[PDB]
Design a protein around this ligand. Sequence first.
Ligand SMILES: CCCCCCCCCCCCC/C=C/[C@@H](O)[C@H](CO)NC(=O)CCCCCCCCCCCCCCCCCCCCCCC
Lengths: 48, 471, 156, 27, 418
Amino acid sequence: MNWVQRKIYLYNVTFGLYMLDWWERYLFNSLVVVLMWFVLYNGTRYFS
Amino acid sequence: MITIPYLTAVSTYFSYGLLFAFGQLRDFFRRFIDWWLQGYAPICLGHEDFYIRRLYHRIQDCFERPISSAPDAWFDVVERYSNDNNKTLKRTTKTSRCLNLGSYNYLGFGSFDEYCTPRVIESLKKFSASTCSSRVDAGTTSVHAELEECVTRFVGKPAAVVFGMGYATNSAIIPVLIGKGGLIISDSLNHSSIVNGARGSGATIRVFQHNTPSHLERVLREQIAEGQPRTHRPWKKIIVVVEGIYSMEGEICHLPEVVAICKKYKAYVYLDEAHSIGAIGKTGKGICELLGVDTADVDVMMGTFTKSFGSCGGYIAGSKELIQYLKHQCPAHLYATSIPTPSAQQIISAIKVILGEDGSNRGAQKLARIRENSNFFRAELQKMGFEVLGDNDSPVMPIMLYNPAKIPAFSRECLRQKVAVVVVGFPATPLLLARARICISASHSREDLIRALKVISKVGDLSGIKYFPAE
Amino acid sequence: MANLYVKAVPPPDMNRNTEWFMYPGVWTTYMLILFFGWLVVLSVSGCSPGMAWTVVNLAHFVVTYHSFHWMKGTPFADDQGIYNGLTWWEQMDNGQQLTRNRKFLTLVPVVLYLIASHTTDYRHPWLFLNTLAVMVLVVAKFPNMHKVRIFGINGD
Amino acid sequence: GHFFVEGLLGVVIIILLTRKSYKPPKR
Amino acid sequence: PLTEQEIDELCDEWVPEPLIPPITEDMKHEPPVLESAAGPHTTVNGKDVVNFASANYLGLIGHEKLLESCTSALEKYGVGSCGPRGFYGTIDVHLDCETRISKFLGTPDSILYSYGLSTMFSTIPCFCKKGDVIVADEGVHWGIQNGLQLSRSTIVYFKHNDMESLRITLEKIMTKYKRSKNLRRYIVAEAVYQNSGQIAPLDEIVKLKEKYRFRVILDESNSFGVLGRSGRGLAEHHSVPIEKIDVVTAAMGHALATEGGFCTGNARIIDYQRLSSSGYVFSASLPPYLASAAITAIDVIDQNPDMLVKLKQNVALLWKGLSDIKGMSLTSNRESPIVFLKLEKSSGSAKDDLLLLEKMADRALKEDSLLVVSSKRSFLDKCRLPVGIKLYVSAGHSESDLLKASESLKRLASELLL
Ligand SMILES: CCCCCCCCCCCCC/C=C/[C@@H](O)[C@H](CO)NC(=O)CCCCCCCCCCCCCCCCCCCCCCC
């Protein structure tokens, strides 16, 4: 395992995604990737 | 009592909320799927066992692992498969060879030694296993009358009675001593047998902070002054129940500071030497010898032969007229079947080894070897940054995890590298405190401990369970 | 990456259902879950903050009323069924009223209703709903409405 | 119609943040 | 409020009760210490005596083929279990025993318990909660009536073996709860009663429960391996499918010469008791050598169905000899192997009848070498059935020792009771 492959693994155990099933884990991962793009774009452009 | 890293105590509640929100969505989308048993009522409501199908079924391969060898330092683990969409694990051939770290033989008597097996086997071909009767009918053999004298010499007290179960030694004896109109100040963390034992009578139950005597006295004062709940009558009895070593906390009781408080308020003490009857003490005589406390200060003493002596059973020690009363009124002595003969012959011949009456000198090496291993293993984990509980001498050392998703991650990554451990979850322990239990015996060599340590250190880097600073 | 330790002391309780609420971090997570949801509804479906604070207040009333004032009993068979006729709210704090934890749970739906009204200029299509929530949610957390059922609904 | 509600709840909020915790009644 | 000095007196004027009551002179009598096993012909104080107090019905104590199977599993696993079943206390022999029992009885699944007497404390409280109804039998042994109290539910009793008093109770239960329909109802019985020696009629019990929608829990430890024509149990006796009985528990410390218990039944009820019991998830499992002998003992029962027909002959030969007794009267059944003998015409009081019975059981062994068992009730037992002496006849008893127990029991009651 390289560095990112270990940080992704550490992210899974701390937030409880290691236990969920293949769709449950993909339904929450996809909903967090959309909230990270709506903050970057908006937040760094709607203020400054 | 348990320092919790604040930031790790916020991601634990967020992980349990994700397992609850995703568990209530699959229940409402399954209640509508029952539109596509004969007149009776369901053996359980859907909302009853919610944490047995939405939490325990996700990690069921970390429990009930079958083995096909004696509970030794090394044993064989049977590999199972999921077959039908992960619902019924079925076992195969193709065992493994792991390093036993989740059993209980502290002194290493649960295997095959050159002094007990030969004697136990020779006494089973003369009495033949069980005797099919009670102890007041036909169940008192010569081996049952000689085993009640060995336990009286070991423990120290003037009399003793041995039973066939360690869990029925607390549900069938507390109702005899106290009833309706009495009080039981129990410690918070007591075994379920004690609790069920207090609920078997009409006695009221209270609870004082785990292992702090300054709260026991404040609980006793209120109860003695106040009286019985509704009708303010004075209690007729008070009994205080404590434990020698509190397992899953690895804590040795503050027995001298609990004896002196109960001795002033006229209460009775009830000791529970389940985990500390062959493990701690310079001669294996328990916590009354390690802490140096008079043995006549405690009224009743209960114990168990399952963990140190490698044989099922239990005992109660007390004064000579307490045993005479129990033998005549206890329900586990009048109705239950006597302890099997080869299970009682393995306690006599194990006690004769610890006391050094076997001719050899290998009874003190166990007691010496079990003190080093537990001290060297616990001192090597603290310097690596782990959070291990215990004092200095108890051979139980829980490692805190705090996250429900680190239970399978810690067990499955240790089994892959051939180390076997035990993990405990939320329905059992409190929501925030999940941990792993490590048992160190007197049969592990130093090389085995070194190998196990270099694996536990490597797996704690991935999961990041090194909550403290290293060195 | 680890600091700020707290030696959480163990209380009495003896009820696995409602004893987890005394440990440290239960308030900072109740507010973090309300903020995380707000941002999750403002991004998946582009809206205004006022229309996001109303959906976070309406969804929080359906998830709290069915958990705190509907389901009775405990999901653990360990205690047989001693509390077979007590809603989580009635089990909380062994019957004690107006405690430190009962004051925070009663002051969360009120403060979450003042933010969903002063960010939507009141109006009338949303002021009704946001007024039915608090009314029905605060009335149930009264010290007098203990073990009382309206017209014998869900009480035997 | 916008200040009579925010002005009243602050009064009600102070009322329960000062009450004394008491045991339930007896039989 | 009481001051912290007013409190200090109330803790000084308080004086507690003694831990135990004073020990009397009639509260101490040591039982016999026997040597060389415990079969039909045992040994006490040198002299050879006749055993009638051990509950081995099939005569498997000391069997040649049980010792060879205990030794092999005792030299391989050890004498201890080390740990619970939920951790690392699950050896393969434990799984093979549960597979063999269910194949013997013809049932999907099975479960093992460590102690024989503790298979009813965790089997009753685990099914009934604090809001259900139980209809017990008012003559059930302590083990069963302790699990009835552990499960905080509503217990209603009925007359001993009176199916007329069962219908009356069921009718009144199905009216006092006409509104509720969530309520779970259970009927708790016992195949061959220990305190009376009567055999339950499983013809009306499974016909009355199929009209009121109840559930049955049979505790058949005194019938499993002896009552049926093939040794299946009570079900075979009354010829009823073993599927109508929802739960079937038994103890293996009777006709199996081992220790432990089990609980047979469907798969949805067996696996639910695995993850939510009390004496299964909080106690050490069976030692492997004790569970490796039950497997051997079950095969002996299958391969030899004649040592059952030889048990009926023994009980019918000891029933025809005690048909003359004056002081007492056979109050048991006729096919059950627990010949009871309640004493006709109560001499003294409750504690006076239990002293005259224990003195007659002591003289029987101290004169002509006979071990018999008499009723022993504690203050926790809530049974009110008549007291008496019992004889656990076996299939290994001879014809000479079977007639030597009726002669010394008929001449010992005549010169005492009367
Ligand atoms: C996806 C992120 C969160 C999404 C929703 C998750 C929050 C739901 C928490 C519900 C709390 C349940 C309280 C009592 C429920 C009882 O009924 C049941 C059965 O009786 N007891 C039990 O299950 C035993 C108690 C243990 C339950 C563990 C759940 C606690 C996990 C989080 C606790 C602290 C975080 C939330 C505190 C309360 C939040 C209230 C819900 C917030 C509204 C969300 C809507 C945006």
